[PDB]
Amino acid sequence: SMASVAEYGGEVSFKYAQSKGEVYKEIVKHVDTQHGVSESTCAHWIANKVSNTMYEKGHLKQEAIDSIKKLQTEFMQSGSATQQFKLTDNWLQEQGVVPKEKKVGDLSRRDEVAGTVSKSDISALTKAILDTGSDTAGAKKISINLEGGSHTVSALVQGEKVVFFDPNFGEMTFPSHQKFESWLKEAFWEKSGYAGKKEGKRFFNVVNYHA
Amino acid sequence: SMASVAEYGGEVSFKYAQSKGEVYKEIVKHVDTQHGVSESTCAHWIANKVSSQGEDFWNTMYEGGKKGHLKQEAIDSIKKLQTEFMQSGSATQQFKLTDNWLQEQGVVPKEKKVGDLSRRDEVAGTVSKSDISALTKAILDTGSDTAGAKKISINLEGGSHTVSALVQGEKVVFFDPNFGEMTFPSHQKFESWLKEAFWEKSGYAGKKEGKRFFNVVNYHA
Numbered sequence: 001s002m003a004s005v006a007e008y009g010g011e012v013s014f015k016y017a018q019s020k021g022e023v024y025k026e027i028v029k030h031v032d033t034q035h036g037v038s039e040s041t042c043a044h045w046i047a048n049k050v051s052n053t054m055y056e057k058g059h060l061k062q063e064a065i066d067s068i069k070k071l072q073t074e075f076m077q078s079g080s081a082t083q084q085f086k087l088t089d090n091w092l093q094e095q096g097v098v099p100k101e102k103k104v105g106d107l108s109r110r111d112e113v114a115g116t117v118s119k120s121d122i123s124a125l126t127k128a129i130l131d132t133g134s135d136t137a138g139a140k141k142i143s144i145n146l147e148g149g150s151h152t153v154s155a156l157v158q159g160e161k162v163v164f165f166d167p168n169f170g171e172m173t174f175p176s177h178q179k180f181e182s183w184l185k186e187a188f189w190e191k192s193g194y195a196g197k198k199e200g201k202r203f204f205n206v207v208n209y210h211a
Numbered sequence: 212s213m214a215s216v217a218e219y220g221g222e223v224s225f226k227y228a229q230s231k232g233e234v235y236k237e238i239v240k241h242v243d244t245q246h247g248v249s250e251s252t253c254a255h256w257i258a259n260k261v262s263s264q265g266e267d268f269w270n271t272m273y274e275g276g277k278k279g280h281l282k283q284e285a286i287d288s289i290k291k292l293q294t295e296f297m298q299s300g301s302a303t304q305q306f307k308l309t310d311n312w313l314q315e316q317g318v319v320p321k322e323k324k325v326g327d328l329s330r331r332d333e334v335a336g337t338v339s340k341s342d343i344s345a346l347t348k349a350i351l352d353t354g355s356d357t358a359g360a361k362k363i364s365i366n367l368e369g370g371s372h373t374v375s376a377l378v379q380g381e382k383v384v385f386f387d388p389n390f391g392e393m394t395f396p397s398h399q400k401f402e403s404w405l406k407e408a409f410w411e412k413s414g415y416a417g418k419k420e421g422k423r424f425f426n427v428v429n430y431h432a
């Protein structure tokens with residue numbers, strides 16, 4: 001967003017009539033909302049299989065949809081990913097689903113398998129899904145992270161003058177480094193959708209050209 | 212919930228009439244294409260600012276009489292470069308292509324020199340929800356000089372997805388709320404289908420290299 005540029009002592013030089021940034025924020029909201037529905041639906045599917053169908057062509061029963069919507073809302077309004085996944089786990093135990101435990105030395109701990117996937121390797125994920133440990137049978141709730149996109153912005157710095165250009169919003173000018181730095185950190189980073197919801201490092205690369 | 216399930220000896224038990232997975236694949240296409248447009252537009256903006264003959268007005272990319280739009284000539288040229296960028300395949304070759312275009316337009320990449328040797332003045336690092344201090348320094352740093360132009364690549368947060376499974380001996384039931392329910396009569400048939408068919412066709416695989424987190428929670432059947 002560029003609502004705050006003038007508040008931080010900058011000027012908007014150009015504003016795109018159709019903000020591809022606003023489209024990106026709607027995409028983030030969509031993918032976030034759809035995670036809630038996916039998590040809630042998988043929880044309901046797991047509870048249904050371990051206790052006999054949730055299906056009505058190509059739709060869930062209305063009572064399943066109402067219950068999925070309820071859990072999804074609660075899931076969404078839980079803060080951290082840790083609290084969200086704890087809320088779904090509590091719901092599953094309330095429905096009589098029993099989480100597996102494993103021994104690590106003498107101690108009982110949750111039978112969760114954490115790991116990594118990539119474009120070219122899902123071997124560890126596949127083994128975690130297929131493993132039933134001591135038993136012949138198991139239900140799994142599988143959380144997977146999706147690839148984020150790539151974005152390019154540009155800047156011209158001339159002494160204390162900073163021109164910042166985001167093809168998703170437009171062009172802004174700040175008359176000092178400090179005014180640009182405060183605006184970028186305190187206004188733009190969150191409001192833009194580039195910050196994300198989770199903690200975690202993402203790469204950046206700056207290529208420098210002569211002015 | 213595709214035709215690939217039966218090809219790998221499985222059965223579709225349920226198919227969502229409205230696939231949230233198909234919507235997700237359209238989103239991936241959009242965000243990928245929009246990287247092309249963002250890269251090409253930033254390249255043009257950099258060439259315009261560095262070429263500039265004093266005042267901005269003399270050679271703006273902005274349409275004078277149409278508020279909040281680029282000139283049609285700038286749009287056509289941006290679409291040309293974006294196409295070339297898109298056809299490159301390999302992020303290394305894509306960025307090399309943009310760099311060649313920038314030099315063709317008279318833009319001069321900065322070098323770090325030690326004795327007789329050069330390398331590109333490019334600064335990598337990391338950002339997060341709560342820290343962009345290293346990014347901010349890389350943008351503001353002009354090295355030797357008081358002036359410089361920057362093309363800034365930022366990686367975005369991917370979303371999260373949940374799927375589920377039930378394994379009973381050799382029977383694998385896999386459920387993706389974005390597609391539906393599939394059943395495989397052996398582990399082998401599930402593993403081959405997941406790795407060779409589903410992972411790419413789902414949109415979950417991605418285009419770039421990069422490790423992404425998964426978590427499997429096990430419940431008694």
Ligand code: NA
Nearest residue numbers: 013163172173
């Ligand atoms: Na400006």
